[model samples]
Target: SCPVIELTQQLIRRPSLSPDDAGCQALLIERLQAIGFTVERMDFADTQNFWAWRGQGETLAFAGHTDVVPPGDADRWINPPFEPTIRDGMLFGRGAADMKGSLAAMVVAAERFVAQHPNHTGRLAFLITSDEEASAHNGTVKVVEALMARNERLDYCLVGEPSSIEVVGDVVKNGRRGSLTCNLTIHGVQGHVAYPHLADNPVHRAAPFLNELVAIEWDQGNEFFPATSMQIANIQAGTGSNNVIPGELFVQFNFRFSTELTDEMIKAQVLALLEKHQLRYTVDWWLSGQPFLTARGKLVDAVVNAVEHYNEIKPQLLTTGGTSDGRFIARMGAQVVELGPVNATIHKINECVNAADLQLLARMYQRIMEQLVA
Candidate 1:
């Protein structure tokens, strides 16, 4: 068994759910410290985060999380969710694919890189947290805030997110779309249905607004992204009694927007549409993340070359995905890319990753480090 695979099994044994490290980060910190890396523990509000670095010059950071989503219904698995099982060349366990496997690969790759080139050219670092799968308030976002406040330089960041589609290194994410959610309540007058003229219907009033909202073209996303999308996740307007009209209509919609449109622009457009329909409503806006991109720069080039060198195929640079910690890392003006194991089973029952693919993944990480830092 490869060292990376063994480390992966050790990490899988720890069920580090959400904001809990479950001793996973401690294991990693110990290994990093053994390699002469200066490790800093930054825990905040029940979340565990750490920043570690070796050597000097422009910084290249490997950003990842030690957290795993809940392993639902563990009894259904072929083996226990927390017990690493290798069968038919696949490693089965929670966080195997999303992404304890990648974490192990990153650490082992750094160890090998440093072993060969003791004095690497640029600084190599790790920015890890245990708060990515949940309310993410105190994870990478806070770490980036502190780093930027100190004017710390971050040149490149490789996030070990499961970006591959079919095979490892098949698709790498160069960016991610922003997310915005809106909760709206439309007001109406309630009355008996028999008296039609006495009650105003907010549902009827919101119909036209919804029609326009669905039809509007938020933006023609650029080369790296598709058009912005708006989806109505939920809507409710009714009374238990069919004879009475509801007094309010509630709607919850979400927008997965591209870099072409800002959150401010989306909000203003929504408000304008509501005014045009002349509806009385109260709305609460939640901006979850802002869109970010790294368009074919040094970091992107290095990653692409590394993937092609191992897989013999050029990985596609995609921006179509859920928000990741990479969004926060991008705020540092560093080029960020996501590369890791195949993601066909992340956050699902019996989550697993190919054992051989993980070995190749470690080599790929080492190649990228050689191209950039070493």
Candidate 2:
């Protein structure tokens, strides 16, 4: 087995859940230090983050998280999640595809790059965090804020997120959609279930409004994205006894929106719809991050070229999938892209990644390094 695989196993063995490194960053710091890279630890609240760099001038970063999602129902797994297992040529573990595997590939690639070109132009850096699957308040967002406060310059960022679908390098992300969540409460009078005329049912009042909400087409999306979508993640209204009409109804929904619309626009549209229905309701909105896209640029081209060199077919650049740390890094005015292993099994029982793909992924990383930094 190669060093990349060995390092991947080492990381997988540690249950570094959200906001907890479990000494994962320590292992990384040790290796990078041996390679003459300067590393900095940035701890915020319960989260742990690290920034490391080698070389100088223009900077290209490999950004990812050291944490893995919890292994739900470990009994269902063929092998223990933390105990790396290989079967049918796939390496099995909690973070294999979601991405300690990618992390390993990047680190090995960086080690090889620095070894061959000690005097390479520009800088190679790592922006890693221990929080991604959970609340991101103290993770990459905080680190990026601190860096931007100092006016730090980051030219390009390759996020090691599992972007592929069927095989490795099949898809990459040049952008991502914005996220907005609405916590809503509809008011009504409480009364006995049989006394239909005596009280108002909030649930009954919300039915029509929800119908409108689901039917409204937010936007035509944009060049890089599909039509904006809304999902009712949660809804509640109840009294312990079936005889009582619930006094209030609660609905929490989220929008995975495209750049064609802004948070203000979405909020305004939703509020107007509520007024049209004449529903008495209160709403609380949380705007996570605005949509960001890295149009065809040096970063995108180099990544595409690297993918092509590794395979005969050119990889497709897409903005599909959930939000990633790329959104935070884009604030630095850097072109961001996501590349990694097949994502068929992330955050699920029996999560695994192809061992061979990780090997080629390391080489692809080195090729990008050669194109941009060398």
Candidate 3:
């Protein structure tokens, strides 16, 4: 129990600020080793990650991140963002709500659970990484790949993300929408802007197509997901000189799609639309993650029951979030769900978690483990 508070403080003091573990992994390894866990450190480029497991029955993992976003404009904080402080029964620091605090809670919860059930029915494991708040190229995603290569199976996973909304146990994320980005370059003949017949403006050709692109409804989302949405992040086609009609138009767009549409479907639809407009274009698609949904299952039932049992509130199953490490772990065939403290102040100065809420979250985690692995 003391380790949670101490570890949280030590992490906050480091000023880790994403893509840098800042020795946070070392601290976690120390605590995990003392608790009889076998720790494996994985360093990819500048990112640091770790996998620690106890017992060998099967794999039931708790995944979280020790990294946090930078403390923006330190002067705006009442106290320094890195200086962990407690006020009004709340612990405040950078990453307090976004993660680090929940990471401590899960660790303490596991420690206590294992102490009571030493020979638990299945494995109790942890996946910690430092790249979650940044590029995320070398974190949980890579570990999941390694686990898959060994044919390691994860029965269920609990991601210590700040999923609670409005109140501590009011919401639990069962799924996430898929995210895809496209970079398009539309080619055209360039000529003097003043000459009407000699010049072809790429932007002029793209205008009507852009309108149709935004207006078309992708799909009617299912019960767990919201309607698919798209946005043009960047659009460029011009020279610094006002009279030059640029030869090429570059447009970057992204989509947050629900389970209602697949990557291939989205791609095909966009390509068809481009063809309909008869525009000469080269398009590149990048898929960040595929949509994932967990319905009635051991993990979902366990989390719902635990929240109802401990918090006296029924958590609504939701798939209304951006994305998390759960997206990566779910690919390992684990039934995954995200649950944690209230997310009202996450990623902001003076971010905090209710001390009592933290205790309740610990209880919730313990109950969830008992329900699933017992």
Candidate 4:
């Protein structure tokens, strides 16, 4: 408990924003090395990351991020965002709820599990990064690709993203939806605003296509996921002058699609809609994270049993959340689950985590080890 608490506080004290670890990984590496785990840099540029493992056989990896989103409006925070302050039972800091606390718990749990059972059959490993909050190529996705290329075996992965609501361990994640982004540029002739019927407006042309995209029902979700939905994130088509009709319209939209549909299908349908509208447009597609789901398996059962054992309630295993590194790990043919602290305050101004709940989380992680690796 002290190990977890102290390590978490130490991590919180550092200001490790995205693409910057600020020595947080150094601390964990030292502690992990002391526990007989071999550590190496699976790191990417501008971010600090490490992979550590011990023992062999079936591998169970604990995944988390050290870099947190920027602390917002520091003046609104009771304590400095980087200073770990314990008031009542909650620990306050920027990354406390989102993942720093969970990382500490995982490390301490690993230390304890390895201390008791040094000859554990399965490999206990960690794949940690400092670029989760950054849109960089050196994030967890790259590490996953590197691992997959080498044929590294990852039977199961537990990501410590904040998945719970109201209470820690109350809601774990069995899977996540896929993210697809579309950047569309509609072109039209620029003309004087006063000219009548001289210029075709791109915005007006894109309106019908936009309506079709917005109204399209991609899929009715199944048992584990919600229906696919599209949202327009950004749209711009102004020349910054009232006397001119803008020549182009840029629309940036995203789809958080369920498992029922593939990216290809979505693209085909969108292209069809654009053709139907007869709008002169150029569209670029980017698939950020493909959807992944883990059916009831040994890893899921172990996690559920661990949570139920440590806490009274059985976690509601849902497949809802923003994209996470779990999507990349899932590509390794591994069953993935996310279990962590309450997410209500993540990325918010007053982010914090319950100390007792995090302690229980450590025990839960350790017990999961007992069930699977031991």
- On a 0 to 100 scale, what is the lDDT of residue 56 in model 3? 78
Model 2: weakest 10-residue lDDT segment is 214-223
Report lDDT per candidate: 0.94, 0.92, 0.86, 0.90
Cα miss at 83, model 3 (Å)?
Answer: 0.6
Q: Which stretches of candidate 4 lie over 4 Å from their true place?
A: 240-243
Candidate 3 per-residue C-alpha lDDT over 1-374 given as tens digits, one digit per residue, 9 for 90 to 100:
46667667787787777778888788778877877889888778887888888887767799998889988898899888989998888888998888887887787888788788888877788899888878898888998888889988788899889988767789998999999998999888898868958878888898889999999999989888879989999988888888898889999999999989999999999999999999999999999888888877888888999999976778988887689988899888889899988999988878888777777888899888787665
lDDT of 1 by residue, 72-113 (tens): 998998899999999999999999999999999999999999
Q: What's the residue-level lDDT of 33 in candidate 3? A: 83
- Name model 3 segments beyond 4 Å from true: 1-3
TM-score of each: 0.99, 0.95, 0.95, 0.96
Once fitted onto the true fold, the runs of candidate 2 whose alpha carbons sit more than 4 angstroms away are 193-197, 240-242
Q: By TM-score, who's the top model here?
A: 1
Best by lDDT: 1
**Tens digits of per-residue lDDT for model 4 on 115-148?**
8898998899999999987685687888888888
The worst-scoring run of ten residues by lDDT in candidate 3 lies at: 1-10
- Model 2's C-alpha root-mean-square deviation from the true structure amounts to 1.6
